[PDB]
RNA sequence: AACGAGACUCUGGCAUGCUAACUAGUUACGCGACCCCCGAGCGGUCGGCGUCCCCCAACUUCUUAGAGGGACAAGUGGCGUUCAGCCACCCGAGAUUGAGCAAUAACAGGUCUGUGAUGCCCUUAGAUGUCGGGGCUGCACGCGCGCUACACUGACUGGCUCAGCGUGUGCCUACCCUACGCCGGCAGGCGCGGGUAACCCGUUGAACCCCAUUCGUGAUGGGGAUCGGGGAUUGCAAUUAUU
């Protein structure tokens, strides 16, 4: 036990030091179940321990692996930003950087006024769905005059 | 359930007994063989039902009169 | 007379039609029949199909 | 002499055939010990005849069983019936009929379907519903 | 010289194929051609299921149509000159007959 | 030798049925002793044929019930198996005595039929008493396990032990003592 | 003792330990990153999964020889959940099956045979029956 | 557009898109009040 | 006296009796081959395991499918104007298997958008008889048939072991079902064979279920809607997203 610290702050977000290490770090945006397992496998960490049982140099080893996947031989087919449209790079985007990357994508579609950009602006379904009977969020209207 | 016998069975059994009383008896398996050679019956399942009511009528005729 | 007087018809409902009456809806491709479903119920006895169950 | 018999048991689509011959007490299903057929929650179901009759009645013969068709549970009931039906047919041909009666009476007084088949098979589906008796929903207004 | 030679028969109707096939066995047996008996292949069933209505109205009834096909094989030990004789009589009904010069 | 069958592990000869109305309908001992609570028998085919089914198999059938569990009988045999092993550790007694006494305590003996909010009191037959007892104690085990770390094998053991002494902590005893209170007001 | 005489699950664990102790079986570089089949949601819990896959594959070739890469993907097939739609059957990874069969040929346990497919050698047959005796002896019969 | 031609000035950000993505085949909906038969209670008797 | 009912036709459950099979199997041996010594006992005649392989061996129990057989309220006990029938039980594979077909007389029921079935009316070269693009999918809102779930009688990761009914190279019309080897995380790609089918895909290695592991009552490792970025395949063409 050692009565060690059981809440910790990692990338401007709080991790509970109380779940299994592979399910604690998925509190970061851009890190799902599948990616969190592969990062800890490259970092040489035992998956059996609770997240409050990592030492100060073990968390810095995990953080420096999450920010640079391609230098620790994580494959290109794993990553969430592929050939990024403005500069051609491959990377994983995390935390408040993922919010801004979507914010730039919706404005890029709106500025040229393509059909995607207009559907996102009017608040309608963007992919191929019908709209007669599903997604209702207004109020019932009466027939009376 | 329902085991009542239709007029096609009941009339054919009476006409057999009027003509062949001296051939017949209480054994169903012998009556079933007699009824196959004295008559043309289209189905095996109808032949079994006719020999069944003939066997019931022989056991009545051994006690007293049957009006038909 | 025009040189462009037709469009490709190598698949889909444009390719196929009934052998008896030239209709395009509800036709049977099974076993090489190529009849319309209403024309099949009309000729089934002459083709040799029957119903038992 | 050569001295052997072949007989079968059934349930649903499953069939099992048992061959037995003069021997020392071997029993196998598909080349495996009958202690190792996979759904071992039912292990007392394929042990039932040898536990009920006792191993002294099995000591003169070697039995080999082959089985196919049906599902995991239907095959246990096919195996079970093939073994108890084989022993009584072997005894009928090669020993005294007074000893056949002991075997048949002890088996039937515990359970029918050690020696007589179960005739049940599926009903066919009918149009207008998801199965044999069920119907789709009905609506009005 | 002799061959091992194979005849196959096919029809929808069963009881015409029975009388055709029995006559091929008799003509071979009386001439000592050492015929191998009729092999019954599995029966083949064709099925078509259709709505009864021409127009899509009413309660939703269906028609279930089917056709059944029956197939047989016989093998002979004889010259190629005499299968041509026996495979030409009693074949009058709507039965297919086909023969191949070596398959045994 | 083959005249005694231990149901895997538990003897039948020492069991007793202490209500004379139920001795014909709770099938235990003699020809009703088997190795497992699983058979393929045709018990549904006639009206009273149901009374010949061993009581441990009737408990096993009634347990594979609630929608997501239909047809899963191999799972349901091991629930009964592990419940009987927990009952023997808690009580020190034969698990078949605990089941028989839980059935004798849980079945209601007066009830009121419906005639128009309006009801009239009537007697209950011994076959409906044993049918009601099984459904009540299976329901009691099923409702307690639904959001607890407790397994259903532990809840079925707790429910049978409380019913065998009539403690009114069980679901089956509270419901029996509700049905007979309401019927006593409709005489 | 033959492979048909012992319980099959601890035979796979005994054979997996024998392969992993030898040091001769080669492994691919991507063994720590692959999903193992299309229908799985996550990578396997055990770092040692490749030796267990080879041990099970050799045991399959003993009981039914003449398999190939396509028929190994049907042995390791399973159910796929499709989110809000109904579920269906789905086959295993072809590249994993092909590299596991090529890794066993490098131990001289497997051969490509006449007609088409693969089978065990006499040396492969010897090493499996040798481990079946070790699994039986561990129970002190 | 199915009845008219809509003009486009091709900005370089449009690269790799289709020409049909900038000329839309319909008018955005804005509702008028519901008519007779729109709800079960709306029934008319003379 | 006639039609409907019933009979009738197909179907399910029984035959160690009949006919008879290299496009179906079993048993056995002339035997032959690999592996194990666990076995009276050796590394064997003899034992164990086989979808390992010949038979110019014997045969039809298991598979196929032709002919016949079998069940009648027939036997025994009660109840019945002692008739017609009804209830229980013995013996038995079996004492209600499930479908198809179906009368007289009607309806302002549906269909002219199934038809070279069809009356009358309309239109007929600025056509109501062919190509290019769009729509049938548009969304404040009311209703109908359904799929997935709210978890521990569970979800996830490994391991083991069982089906039945069918379809298959398109005859204008141009496409079929797939074993085996190699490349790729995957979807997929290249090479090279079999099948017009009891012959090849195929012993159709199906899912739930079964055995072991991890989570711990938390909208949680339950649930997977909504939405960003990248890669294949069909096609003449995929944006209003084919899969």
From Swiss-Prot, chain A:
Disulfide bonds: none annotated. Keywords: Acetylation, Cytoplasm, Isopeptide bond, Ribonucleoprotein, Ribosomal protein, RNA-binding, rRNA-binding, Ubl conjugation. The keyword Lipoprotein does not apply. Its main location: cytoplasm. GO terms for biological process: translation. The modification N6-acetyllysine is found at residues 89, 101. It comes from the Eukaryota. The keyword Ubl conjugation applies. It holds the Pfam family Ribosomal_S13. It is found in: Cytoplasm. InterPro entries: Rbsml_uS13_C (IPR027437), Ribosomal_uS13 (IPR001892), Ribosomal_uS13-like_H2TH (IPR010979), Ribosomal_uS13_CS (IPR018269). One of its GO terms (cellular component) is small ribosomal subunit. GO terms for molecular function: rRNA binding; structural constituent of ribosome. There is a cross-link at residues 86, 89, 101 (Glycyl lysine isopeptide (Lys-Gly) (interchain with G-Cter in SUMO2)). Component of the small ribosomal subunit. Component of the small ribosomal subunit. The ribosome is a large ribonucleoprotein complex responsible for the synthesis of proteins in the cell. Belongs to the universal ribosomal protein uS13 family. This is Small ribosomal subunit protein uS13. The lineage of its organism: Eukaryota, Metazoa, Chordata, Craniata, Vertebrata.
Swiss-Prot record, chain B:
The modification N6-succinyllysine is found at residue 19. It is found in: Cytoplasm; Nucleus, Nucleolus. GO terms for molecular function: structural constituent of ribosome. The keyword DNA-binding does not apply. Keywords: Cytoplasm, Isopeptide bond, Nucleus, Phosphoprotein, Ribonucleoprotein, Ribosomal protein, Ubl conjugation. GO terms for cellular component: cytosolic ribosome; nucleolus; ribonucleoprotein complex. GO terms for biological process: translation. Belongs to the eukaryotic ribosomal protein eS17 family. Component of the small ribosomal subunit. The ribosome is a large ribonucleoprotein complex responsible for the synthesis of proteins in the cell. Part of the small subunit (SSU) processome, first precursor of the small eukaryotic ribosomal subunit. During the assembly of the SSU processome in the nucleolus, many ribosome biogenesis factors, an RNA chaperone and ribosomal proteins associate with the nascent pre-rRNA and work in concert to generate RNA folding, modifications, rearrangements and cleavage as well as targeted degradation of pre-ribosomal RNA by the RNA exosome. Component of the small ribosomal subunit. Part of the small subunit (SSU) processome, composed of more than 70 proteins and the RNA chaperone small nucleolar RNA (snoRNA) U3. This is Small ribosomal subunit protein eS17. It comes from Oryctolagus cuniculus (Rabbit). The gene is RPS17. The chain holds residues 1 to 68 of 135 of the full protein.
Curated annotation (Swiss-Prot), chain D:
It is found in: Cytoplasm; Nucleus, Nucleolus. The modification N6-acetyllysine is found at residue 55. InterPro entries: Ribosomal_Su5_D2-typ_SF, Ribosomal_uS9, Ribosomal_uS9_CS, Ribsml_uS5_D2-typ_fold_subgr. Component of the small ribosomal subunit. Part of the small subunit (SSU) processome, composed of more than 70 proteins and the RNA chaperone small nucleolar RNA (snoRNA) U3. This is Small ribosomal subunit protein uS9. GO terms for molecular function: RNA binding; structural constituent of ribosome. It comes from Oryctolagus cuniculus (Rabbit). GO terms for cellular component: cytosolic ribosome; cytosolic small ribosomal subunit; nucleolus. Belongs to the universal ribosomal protein uS9 family. It comes from the Eukaryota. Its main location: cytoplasm. Keywords: Acetylation, Cytoplasm, Nucleus, Phosphoprotein, Ribonucleoprotein, Ribosomal protein. Component of the small ribosomal subunit. The ribosome is a large ribonucleoprotein complex responsible for the synthesis of proteins in the cell. Part of the small subunit (SSU) processome, first precursor of the small eukaryotic ribosomal subunit. During the assembly of the SSU processome in the nucleolus, many ribosome biogenesis factors, an RNA chaperone and ribosomal proteins associate with the nascent pre-rRNA and work in concert to generate RNA folding, modifications, rearrangements and cleavage as well as targeted degradation of pre-ribosomal RNA by the RNA exosome.
From Swiss-Prot, chain E:
Pfam families: Ribosomal_S10. GO terms for cellular component: cytosolic ribosome; small ribosomal subunit. One of its GO terms (molecular function) is RNA binding. Its main location: cytoplasm. Keywords: Acetylation, Cytoplasm, Isopeptide bond, Phosphoprotein, Ribonucleoprotein, Ribosomal protein, Ubl conjugation. Polyubiquitinated by ZNF598 via 'Lys-63'-linked ubiquitin chains when a ribosome has stalled, initiating the ribosome quality control (RQC) pathway to degrade the potentially detrimental aberrant nascent polypeptide. Deubiquitinated by OTUD3 and USP21, antagonizing ZNF598 activity. Ufmylated by UFL1. InterPro entries: Ribosomal_uS10 (IPR001848), Ribosomal_uS10_CS (IPR018268), Ribosomal_uS10_dom (IPR027486), Ribosomal_uS10_dom_sf (IPR036838), Ribosomal_uS10_euk/arc (IPR005729). It is found in: Cytoplasm. One of its GO terms (biological process) is translation. The modification Phosphoserine is found at residue 78. It comes from the Eukaryota. The modification N6-acetyllysine is found at residues 19, 60. SUPFAM superfamilies: Ribosomal protein S10. PROSITE patterns: RIBOSOMAL_S10. Component of the small ribosomal subunit. The ribosome is a large ribonucleoprotein complex responsible for the synthesis of proteins in the cell. Component of the 40S small ribosomal subunit. Belongs to the universal ribosomal protein uS10 family. This is Small ribosomal subunit protein uS10.
């Amino acid at each position: 036990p050692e009565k060690f610290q059981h809440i910790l702050r990692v990338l401007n977000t709080n991790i509970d030091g109380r779940r299994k290490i592979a399910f604690a770090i998925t509190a970061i945006k851009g890190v799902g179940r599948r990616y969190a397992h592969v990062v800890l496998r490259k970092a040489d960490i035992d998956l059996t321990k609770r997240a409050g049982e990592l030492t100060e140099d073990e968390v810095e080893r995990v953080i420096t692996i999450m920010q640079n996947p391609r230098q620790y031989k994580i494959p290109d087919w794993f990553l969430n930003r592929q050939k990024d449209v403005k500069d051609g790079k491959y990377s994983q985007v995390l935390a408040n950087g993922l919010d801004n990357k979507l914010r730039e994508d919706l404005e890029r579609l709106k500025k040229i006024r393509a059909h995607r950009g207009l559907r996102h602006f009017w608040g309608l379904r963007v992919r191929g769905q019908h709209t007669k009977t599903t997604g209702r969020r207004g109020r019932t209207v009466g027939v009376s005059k | 359930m329902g085991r009542v016998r239709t007029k096609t069975v009941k009339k054919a059994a009476r006409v057999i007994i009027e003509k062949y009383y001296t051939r017949l008896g209480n054994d169903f398996h012998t009556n079933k063989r007699v009824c196959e050679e004295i008559a043309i019956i289209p189905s095996k399942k109808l032949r079994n039902k006719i020999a069944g009511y003939v066997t019931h009528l022989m056991k009545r005729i051994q006690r007293g009169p049957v009006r038909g | 007379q025009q040189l462009y007087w037709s469009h490709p018809r190598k698949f889909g409902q444009g390719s196929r039609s009934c052998r008896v009456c030239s209709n395009r809806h509800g036709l049977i491709r099974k076993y090489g029949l190529n009849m319309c479903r209403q024309c099949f119920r009309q000729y089934a006895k002459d083709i040799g199909f029957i119903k038992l169950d | 002499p050569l001295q052997s018999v072949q007989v079968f048991g059934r349930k649903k689509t499953a069939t099992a055939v048992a061959h037995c011959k003069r021997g020392n007490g071997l029993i196998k299903v598909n080349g495996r010990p009958l202690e190792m057929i996979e759904p071992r929650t039912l292990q007392y179901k394929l042990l039932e005849p040898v536990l009920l009759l006792g191993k002294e009645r099995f000591a003169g013969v070697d039995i080999r069983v082959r089985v196919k068709g049906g599902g995991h549970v239907a095959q246990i009931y096919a195996i079970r019936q093939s073994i108890s039906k084989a022993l009584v047919a072997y005894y009928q041909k090669y020993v005294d009929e007074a000893s056949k009666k002991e075997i048949k009476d002890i088996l039937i007084q515990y359970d029918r379907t050690l020696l007589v088949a179960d005739p049940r098979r599926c009903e066919s589906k009918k149009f207008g519903g998801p199965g044999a008796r069920a119907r789709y929903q009905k609506s009005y207004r | 010289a002799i061959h091992r030679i194979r005849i196959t028969l096919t029809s929808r109707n069963v009881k015409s194929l029975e009388k055709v096939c029995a006559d091929l066995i008799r003509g071979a047996k009386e001439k000592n051609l050492k015929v191998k008996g009729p092999v019954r292949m599995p029966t083949k069933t064709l099925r078509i299921t259709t709505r009864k209505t021409p127009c899509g109205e009413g309660s939703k009834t269906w028609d279930r149509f089917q056709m059944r096909i029956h197939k047989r094989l016989i093998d002979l030990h004889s010259p190629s000159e005499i299968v041509k004789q026996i495979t030409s009589i009693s074949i009058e009904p709507g039965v297919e007959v086909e023969v191949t010069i070596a398959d045994a | 030798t083959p005249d005694i069958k231990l149901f895997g592990k538990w003897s039948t000869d020492d069991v007793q049925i202490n209500d004379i109305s139920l001795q014909d309908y709770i099938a235990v001992k003699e020809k009703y002793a088997k190795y497992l609570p699983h058979s393929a028998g045709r018990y549904a085919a006639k009206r009273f044929r149901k009374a010949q089914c061993p009581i441990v198999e009737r408990l096993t059938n009634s347990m594979m019930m609630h929608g997501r569990n239909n047809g899963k009988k191999l799972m349901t045999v091991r629930i009964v198996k592990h419940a009987f092993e927990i009952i023997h550790l808690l009580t020190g007694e034969n698990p078949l005595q605990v089941l028989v006494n839980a059935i004798i305590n849980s079945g209601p003996r007066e009830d009121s039929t419906r005639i128009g909010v309006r009801r009239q009191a009537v007697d209950v037959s011994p076959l409906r008493r044993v049918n009601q007892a099984i459904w009540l104690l299976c329901t009691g085990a099923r409702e307690a396990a639904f959001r607890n770390i407790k397994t259903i094998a532990e809840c079925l053991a707790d429910e049978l032990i409380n019913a065998a002494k009539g403690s009114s902590n069980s679901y089956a005893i509270k419901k029996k003592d509700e049905l007979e209170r309401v019927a006593k007001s409709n005489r | 003792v033959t492979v048909k005489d012992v319980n099959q699950q601890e035979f796979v664990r005994a054979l997996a330990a024998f392969l992993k102790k030898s040091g001769k079986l080669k492994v691919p570089e991507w063994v720590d990153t692959v999903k193992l089949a299309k229908h799985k949601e996550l990578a396997p819990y055990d770092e040692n999964w490749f030796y267990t896959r080879a041990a099970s594959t050799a045991r399959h070739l003993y009981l039914r020889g003449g398999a190939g890469v396509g028929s190994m993907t049907k042995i390791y097939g399973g159910r796929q959940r499709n989110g809000v739609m109904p579920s269906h059957f789905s086959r295993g990874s072809k590249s994993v099956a092909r590299r596991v069969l090529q890794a066993l040929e490098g131990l001289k346990m497997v051969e490509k045979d006449q007609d088409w497919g693969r089978k065990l050698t006499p040396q492969g047959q010897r090493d499996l029956d040798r481990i079946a005796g070790q699994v039986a002896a561990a129970k002190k019969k | 557009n199915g009845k008219t031609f809509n003009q486009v000035e091709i900005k370089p950000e449009m690269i790799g898109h289709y020409l049909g993505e900038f000329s839309i085949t319909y008018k955005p909906v804005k509702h008028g009040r519901p008519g007779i038969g729109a709800t079960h209670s709306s029934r008319f008797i003379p």
